[PDB]
Amino acid sequence: KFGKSLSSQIVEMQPEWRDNFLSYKDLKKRLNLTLEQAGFVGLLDAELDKFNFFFLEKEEEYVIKQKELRERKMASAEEVMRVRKEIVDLHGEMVLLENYSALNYTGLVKILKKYDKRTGSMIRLPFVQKVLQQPFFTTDLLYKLVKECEEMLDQLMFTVLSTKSLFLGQKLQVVQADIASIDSDAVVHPTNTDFYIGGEVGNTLEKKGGKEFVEAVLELRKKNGPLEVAGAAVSAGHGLPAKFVIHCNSPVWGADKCEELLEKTVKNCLALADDKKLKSIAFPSIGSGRNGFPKQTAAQLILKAISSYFVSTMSSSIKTVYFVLFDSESIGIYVQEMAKL
Amino acid sequence: SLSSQIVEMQPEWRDNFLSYKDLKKRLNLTLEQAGFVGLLDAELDKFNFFFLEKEEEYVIKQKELRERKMASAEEVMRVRKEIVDLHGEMVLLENYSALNYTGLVKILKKYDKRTGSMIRLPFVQKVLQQPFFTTDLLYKLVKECEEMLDQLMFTVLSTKSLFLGQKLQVVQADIASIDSDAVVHPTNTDFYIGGEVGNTLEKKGGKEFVEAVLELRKKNGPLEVAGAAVSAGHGLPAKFVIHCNSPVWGADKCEELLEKTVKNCLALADDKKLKSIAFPSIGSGRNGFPKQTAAQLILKAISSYFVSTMSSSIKTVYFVLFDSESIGIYVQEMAKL
Amino acid sequence: MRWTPELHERFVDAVNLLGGSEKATPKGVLKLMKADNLTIYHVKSHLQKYRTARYRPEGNFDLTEALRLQLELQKRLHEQLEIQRSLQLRILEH
Amino acid sequence: RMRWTPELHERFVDAVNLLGGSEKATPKGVLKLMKADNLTIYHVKSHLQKYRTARYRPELSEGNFDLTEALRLQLELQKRLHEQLEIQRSLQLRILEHHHHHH
Amino acid sequence: GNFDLTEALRLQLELQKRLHEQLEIQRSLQLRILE
Numbered sequence: 001k002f003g004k005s006l007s008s009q010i011v012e013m014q015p016e017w018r019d020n021f022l023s024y025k026d027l028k029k030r031l032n033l034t035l036e037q038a039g040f041v042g043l044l045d046a047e048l049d050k051f052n053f054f055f056l057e058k059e060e061e062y063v064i065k066q067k068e069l070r071e072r073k074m075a076s077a078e079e080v081m082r083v084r085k086e087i088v089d090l091h092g093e094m095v096l097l098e099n100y101s102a103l104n105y106t107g108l109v110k111i112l113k114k115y116d117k118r119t120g121s122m123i124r125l126p127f128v129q130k131v132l133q134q135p136f137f138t139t140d141l142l143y144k145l146v147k148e149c150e151e152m153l154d155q156l157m158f159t160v161l162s163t164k165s166l167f168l169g170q171k172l173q174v175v176q177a178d179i180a181s182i183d184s185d186a187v188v189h190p191t192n193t194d195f196y197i198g199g200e201v202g203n204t205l206e207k208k209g210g211k212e213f214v215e216a217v218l219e220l221r222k223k224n225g226p227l228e229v230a231g232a233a234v235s236a237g238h239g240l241p242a243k244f245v246i247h248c249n250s251p252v253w254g255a256d257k258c259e260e261l262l263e264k265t266v267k268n269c270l271a272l273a274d275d276k277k278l279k280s281i282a283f284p285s286i287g288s289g290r291n292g293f294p295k296q297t298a299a300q301l302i303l304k305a306i307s308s309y310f311v312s313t314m315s316s317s318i319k320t321v322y323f324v325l326f327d328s329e330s331i332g333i334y335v336q337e338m339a340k341l
Numbered sequence: 342s343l344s345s346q347i348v349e350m351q352p353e354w355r356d357n358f359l360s361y362k363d364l365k366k367r368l369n370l371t372l373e374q375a376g377f378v379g380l381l382d383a384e385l386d387k388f389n390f391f392f393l394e395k396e397e398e399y400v401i402k403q404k405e406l407r408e409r410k411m412a413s414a415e416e417v418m419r420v421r422k423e424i425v426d427l428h429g430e431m432v433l434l435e436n437y438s439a440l441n442y443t444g445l446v447k448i449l450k451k452y453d454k455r456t457g458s459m460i461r462l463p464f465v466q467k468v469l470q471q472p473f474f475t476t477d478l479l480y481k482l483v484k485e486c487e488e489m490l491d492q493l494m495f496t497v498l499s500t501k502s503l504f505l506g507q508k509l510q511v512v513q514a515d516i517a518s519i520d521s522d523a524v525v526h527p528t529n530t531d532f533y534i535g536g537e538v539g540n541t542l543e544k545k546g547g548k549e550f551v552e553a554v555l556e557l558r559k560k561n562g563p564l565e566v567a568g569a570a571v572s573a574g575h576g577l578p579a580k581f582v583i584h585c586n587s588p589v590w591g592a593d594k595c596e597e598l599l600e601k602t603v604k605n606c607l608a609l610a611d612d613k614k615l616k617s618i619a620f621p622s623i624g625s626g627r628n629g630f631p632k633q634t635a636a637q638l639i640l641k642a643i644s645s646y647f648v649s650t651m652s653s654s655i656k657t658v659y660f661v662l663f664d665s666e667s668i669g670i671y672v673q674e675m676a677k678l
Numbered sequence: 679m680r681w682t683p684e685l686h687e688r689f690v691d692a693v694n695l696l697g698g699s700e701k702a703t704p705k706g707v708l709k710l711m712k713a714d715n716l717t718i719y720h721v722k723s724h725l726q727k728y729r730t731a732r733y734r735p736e737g738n739f740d741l742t743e744a745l746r747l748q749l750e751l752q753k754r755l756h757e758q759l760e761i762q763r764s765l766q767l768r769i770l771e772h
Numbered sequence: 773r774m775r776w777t778p779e780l781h782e783r784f785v786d787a788v789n790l791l792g793g794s795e796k797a798t799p800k801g802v803l804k805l806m807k808a809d810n811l812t813i814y815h816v817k818s819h820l821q822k823y824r825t826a827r828y829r830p831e832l833s834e835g836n837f838d839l840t841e842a843l844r845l846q847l848e849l850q851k852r853l854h855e856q857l858e859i860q861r862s863l864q865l866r867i868l869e870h871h872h873h874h875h
Numbered sequence: 876g877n878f879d880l881t882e883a884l885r886l887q888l889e890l891q892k893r894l895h896e897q898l899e900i901q902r903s904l905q906l907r908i909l910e
């Protein structure tokens with residue numbers, strides 16, 4: 001299917017970039033096929049020459065652009081340094097003017113006292129009252145200007161175990177709590193084809209939820225019948241703080257393409273969560289334990305599937321993904337593999 | 342005083358303060374009252390004129406600096422955007438070359454299959470000699486671009502903030518390669534360096550680390566149980582290495598001894614005014630301590646130490662762990678902190 | 679004479695309206711600012727200062743930290759001057 | 773010859789600066805200043821063309837959080853693709869070496 | 876026969892890498908078109 005993926009990547013590119021990958025009409029010519037085979041190899045050489053020319057042109061352009069942008073980066077850093085230096089200097093000068101005003105006031109009070117003592121009069125108080133009205137004393141504007149300079153310089157210069165802010169814009173939290181009580185929009189329940197409720201997840205959901213929860217599970221099984229492997233279905237979270245419950249049939253370790261089936265299970269759960277326009281989903285320990293998956297393998301596969309799903313679905317409404325874990329080794333493995341996404 | 346204050350100032354500030362010449366005038370002296378008051382009013386007018394001139398100048402300068410700063414910010418954003426776009430175009434060219442090479446390989450395989458020939462290998466050898474699909478220089482350009490972008494703007498696994506602002510961080514790295522000020526080395530009474538931490542520390546430090554350990558053993562002698570001693574981090578990114586003798590599980594009051602071990606390591610870190618310290622898995626494993634028990638006791642010791650030591654200079658405490666179960670246990674027990 | 683950032687903003691706008699920043703006339707700027715009883719002399723001196731000021735002739739983190747320390751010292755000095763002012767006024771109250 | 777590299781481009785820009793502004797530099801003088809082997813006036817001159825065109829900046833004479841996050845997302849995607857392409861490079865080299873030494 | 880098994884594993888890795896790179900270049904062109 002290499003040709004299909006190649007063409008799907010081409011169609012979304014700029015006209016310059018298209019018609020410079022090798023055409024996949026060479027399969028037709030190949031079919032029509034040592035002299036004419038030598039002509040076919042000459043066609044291959046023509047494709048090589050096309051690649052050479054295009055690549056060399058783009059490479060020269062990129063070299064020039066990178067030297068230019070490095071020069072501009074150095075210039076910009078120098079300019080930012082100069083600007084902040086000048087602003088700090090202006091701040092200091094304003095403070096120095098304040099000190100000038102205060103020091104002159106002090107000396108003036110001193111000389112007024114000396115005058116009142118020399119003559120025996122009492123003019124210091126009214127003279128200072130008049131001095132207070134002088135603009136060299138009204139330093140309110142200096143306070144405002146210093147505050148402005150300082151603001152410019154400031155702008156220029158349920159237990160959660162582990163968090164990971166994904167580069168795509170979502171939050172991956174390994175938490176520890178009763179999954180039935182966690183206020184998540186969706187809660188994933190791994191089950192079998194016949195929708196068993198014997199799971200630990202199923203047990204706590206049956207304890208928290210009422211008879212209406214079991215009735216909703218039964219009605220979901222009535223509507224969809226058997227649940228195929230890697231498939232998933234959605235029921236309403238009746239009697240639960242969760243809005244919806246997403247049941248899934250996780251594959252068994254050792255089956256044909258069981259890892260791809262686990263990835264598909266995770267992706268189907270996420271797709272169903274987006275089908276209900278939900279913003280959060282809670283995943284228990286899936287794959288490991290009952291289904292025989294080793295812990296590290298299942299963790300890395302699930303995290304891979306989540307990341308690739310969110311890569312291929314930019315319109316997704318899911319903002320937070322919870323991982324409800326109790327096994328200490330599983331917690332450590334999930335933290336390790338989650339920090340590497 | 343006043344003159345000594347005005348010495349270290351620019352010329353326009355000099356001869357603009359209160360001239361003390363009026364003292365002589367005061368010594369010469371209501372007619373002179375009017376004369377003196379007029380001189381004082383002249384000084385006040387001088388003050389006002391100078392102050393208003395400086396204020397106008399400062400307003401002008403602030404306007405100019407604000408506009409200049411906004412211009413520089415626009416230029417920063419433009420340069421950042423353009424470098425990201427160039428990085429993207431270069432990655433697209435790499436993908437171009439890779440896709441074309443893969444298509445060529447597929448076509449060569451199909452040709453060798455249909456025609457019954459064997460030219461895929463020499464044709465690919467020829468392809469290797471072409472100007473495209475020689476992306477060492479392009480890779481270096483992309484790497485330098487990522488460097489510049491990092492400037493323009495070891496893995497931490499979990500972080501817990503204490504009440505007094507200290508950071509407990511479980512990280513995944515080599516404990517010898519961390520740049521923490523102090524690195525704790527669990528050992529015995531004879532400063533044995535054959536432990537796990539011992540071997541990695543020795544790999545990094547070498548002869549200098551071994552000499553530091555030997556000199557510390559000679560200066561300190563036997564390392565008592567729950568004791569600790571500092572050595573210089575010669576040949577190590579760390580500044581110092583705190584060797585400790587963790588107690589053995591099942592010994593008399595081994596819990597209190599482990600608590601005292603951790604607190605003595607922290608006290609030695611504070612004696613040298615260190616800002617960060619790295620802890621490996623202490624007590625658990627070699628000394629028979631179960632993992633969760635040791636992790637909890639160590640975390641309690643750290644917490645109560647920071648409670649009882651208000652003048653502690655330690656800001657960050659690293660936990661370098663390799664076992665996944667140990668990492669999970671420490672994460673869970675920090676959640677309980 | 680008492681210039682303020684708001685009046686200076688209005689002044690810069692009026693200068694931008696009256697041709698270029700260098701090819702400007704204080705009388706025209708005054709005609710564009712018929713408020714606060716501004717004079718030709720004061721506006722002319724302010725334009726002279728503005729024209730003379732707008733001319734721009736044509737481990738680093740250690741220096742940046744030294745600059746941060748300078749700013750911090752200046753801020754502390756400003757706060758000390760503020761408490762000085764309040765203290766001196768309270769003395770004048772006796 | 774026509775393979776312009778960062779070092780050769782640096783030498784070219786240095787020669788241009790020796791002659792003055794790129795707008796007033798002469799390709800013949802640049803060729804005289806560059807002792808690079810097998811360097812023709814055609815290559816020097818076409819490259820001076822591309823350089824002068826790239827150096828022009830017309831933008832000089834004329835929410836931020838969402839924009840910065842979109843830019844950071846783009847950059848992160850590009851970085852991921854680059855490292856994936858490096859891994860693919862390694863795999864291709866291994867497969868080709870094994871097919872060369874084992875047929 | 877371990878050599879042939881290694882070669883098959885490397886080919887599988889190559890296909891997986893191709894699919895992932897396709898997804899990523901798709902997302903990048905998407906982000907460009909949306910902005």
Ligand SMILES: O=P(O)(O)O[C@H]1[C@H](OP(=O)(O)O)[C@@H](OP(=O)(O)O)[C@H](OP(=O)(O)O)[C@@H](OP(=O)(O)O)[C@@H]1OP(=O)(O)O
Nearest residue numbers: 001002003004005006024026027028030031447448450451
């Ligand atoms: O692009 P490919 O990787 O070569 O995939 C297939 C190839 O199957 P493979 O996945 O095993 O290589 C088909 O051959 P089969 O093994 O299924 O018989 C082949 O031919 P058919 O589907 O007609 O049998 C088909 O087309 P082509 O004849 O052009 O090589 C081609 O896929 P593409 O159409 O994308 O090349």
Ligand SMILES: O=P(O)(O)O[C@H]1[C@H](OP(=O)(O)O)[C@@H](OP(=O)(O)O)[C@H](OP(=O)(O)O)[C@@H](OP(=O)(O)O)[C@@H]1OP(=O)(O)O
Nearest residue numbers: 107109110111112113114115117118342343344361364365
């Ligand atoms: O101006 P100061 O740096 O503060 O020091 C004093 C001043 O002290 P006070 O103003 O704080 O009281 C004297 O003031 P009086 O005695 O008039 O109150 C003053 O006058 P005297 O000469 O009568 O002591 C003397 O003046 P001078 O510099 O001429 O000595 C002067 O300076 P000194 O520190 O040298 O004493």
